[PDB]
Subunit: 199 residues, 5 copies
């Protein structure tokens, strides 16, 4: 239980063993969720990489925020992948918030405070509870994250825009699954903790 | 009679059966009108779709706000179509207000608070009163079943309709989110009937 | 004598008979002048059209503000034409003010409050007094205006920039030839009076 | 001695005889200087023209601010020319301030309040005192448009000072003062209120 | 010990002998550092040049901020070089701050107040203390233009701190202080008021 406020994990160079493991005190399977985070990297234009990986015994790609080169963002929950295209890539810290709701299969994807069209994905699904959450790696390094990532947070329900807007503006949020202000992690490899570059 | 304030219909995926039906307490035929709405979608650059469909038995295209790919907006009242070209399309929630006045055939088309040149269309014509208003789908057969190739995928809301031509000042206000008092289709007191894969979620645009 | 304040003439569709005729209480020949107006149309990119036509018995093109496609603005006084080029045309209401001074032949051309280089055109001449001023059509004993035009005003002397700036900002002015606040016109054809679209 | 404040010379059409002559009460040769002015024209994209011409008996191009088409600004003092390139030309009134200092040969060139890299030119030189300063002409290149707010100091203005002049702050020139100009017109050139603020 | 506040070294023309030598009262080897400076030049698009050169007996390129044409910025400490690419070059005064930390080999590179992705370079390593710091030269690589506001700390500045320095806030360097610089000029290089604000 550490307060990562104002700090961020940084992955200096391409590796095959460096990654961060977040431990979520999960007890109930997810029927909806929302994860937000900040990440800054220069890979975008050259190759792909993993931002957020959430895997279960039965499914290694239960919930995964990925960036496939020359295409855009790839949000995938429960093996099924959906794509949020992005034509012109810009090098700069970016903040994202994505959410999925089983009851309707509506997935939202917010980038830098602005929302992308809503979409449908994995209706009537159910995300496993006991899982292994990892930052910087793909549960292979050709998909490794090189740069900084931080301010990751996760709620077990779908945040409303107003709420999302606030989080972006750096307003007070109360996560209930993954809280940056009280994170329980386990580092491994060449990854450090330094003050965050984005405001 | 529901207050849809701060909410919006969302059409997640391409369908052939999903659509929303608005019920207007119409009694007199329209001699002029104004309809405004908010819609956000990603189709624009790939295919066309229907924004607002108002059809009468005698006429399937009484009043219809459509988006024909690679061209722009297609406003059509009473079968006759007029085009409001738009070269560079930008992905983002957009708000539109269009109005037609029989006595002159002058149709206005406001986009995001800014107006496009005035035009002439179906002067003298008269819009039927008893009609079927639908959101998200293209009435091409006043009977039932539709053809997805023109379906709306995304969110649409804040639709409102007056039986007279709104003045710019008024239109400006509506855009800024000021109070107004529609008299045909009121978002604050909407009477609808959903059908298919369409939900009600908080609106994304401010 | 009507107060056209906050209103504008609108020419809905292409015609060969629609036009507006302004009546100026002229008694002395012009030795200098300034005319300002607001007009919004979509023709610009396709064909040419007449904005302001002022013709005399001896000369039908005494003073005429025209828009020749793919070139720019064509200001012409007394048969002689001068050109104010405009490369990239933008669809939006535009406000213009142009002025000519016999004593020097210096013609100014202001667009949306900003001025274009000064030019020389007909020095010594004297514009006729008794004339027929028309809006929307081209006087000549195909090139009709389709859209809205309003806020036309005319002084018998050259307005200073400061003055011009004010007019643009919507500040009080006192025209002495053609006053929008006390216009005396005569419509003819398919042309209506509706509230102006530009602020 | 006239106060040209708020006014500007305007050259309506291309001529071969129109120009303005400024008279400087010079007595000592220049060992450094700074000249600023406002000029608005449409030639830029088509041909070249002379902005400021300062010539001496032995040298007709003692100090000259010129605009060579498709290249940029050409500042030249004492016959030697230096170039301040400008790729994308934009039609709009522009204000410039350029200065040269013999002791180092460092020439500054400010455009619309922003400075261009410093450069070296004619170090050790010494500009003649008795000269003929002309606006609009080259002592094919005539200036067509308006030019005004010309001022000249016999020393190098500091950035702060230059910044002020641009913002329209009070400046006390000591060679060529717009507020107390002594000129002599000739040709088709008039005096009208300035277009730029 | 001079207060170079509001002034800058200017290298007017390409030379093979002109340069500035900074003297640092170093006594302990560096285990981390941060250097910031302002430089304005027109070379960028044509050739390469040296911004900051710090060399030791053991390694003449102990720490060097360089600009390799058509590529971007080249930060190199202890011989090992790393590259901070920059596609579209823009002519204008630029301010940079770069820092390296032995304990992790994390090098930061801030340009005009904005940071570039972090990188790893020379870990464990120890920069020599007794060195020769030079500005404008490489201990077809000479700097032509102005350079100033150089400062150096023996520890890694935090973003907040860096942000402040950029905004012109008060800072307390402990290795190279612009407000109390001890230098030695040599060649055609002068001291003039800085062009950038």
């Amino acid at each position: 239980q550490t307060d990562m406020s104002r700090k961020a994990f940084v992955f200096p160079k391409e590796s095959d063993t460096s990654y961060v493991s977040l431990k979520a005190p999960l007890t109930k399977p997810l029927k909806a969720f929302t994860v937000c985070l900040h990440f800054y990297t220069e890979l975008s234009s050259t190759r792909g990489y993993s931002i957020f990986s959430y895997a279960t015994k039965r499914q290694d790609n239960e919930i995964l925020i990925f960036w496939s080169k020359d295409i855009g963002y790839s949000f995938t929950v429960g093996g099924s992948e959906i794509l949020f295209e992005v034509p012109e890539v810009t090098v700069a810290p970016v903040h994202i918030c994505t959410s999925w709701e089983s009851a309707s299969g509506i997935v939202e994807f917010w980038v830098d405070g602005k929302p992308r069209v809503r979409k449908s994905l994995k209706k009537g699904y159910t995300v496993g509870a006991e899982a292994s959450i990892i930052l910087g790696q793909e549960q292979e390094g050709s998909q490794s994250l090189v740069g900084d990532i931080g301010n990751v947070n996760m709620w077990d329900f779908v945040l409303s825009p107003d709420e999302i807007n606030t989080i972006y503006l750096g307003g007070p949020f109360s996560p209930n699954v993954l809280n940056w202000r009280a994170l329980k992690y386990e580092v491994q490899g060449e990854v450090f903790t330094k003050p965050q570059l984005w405001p």
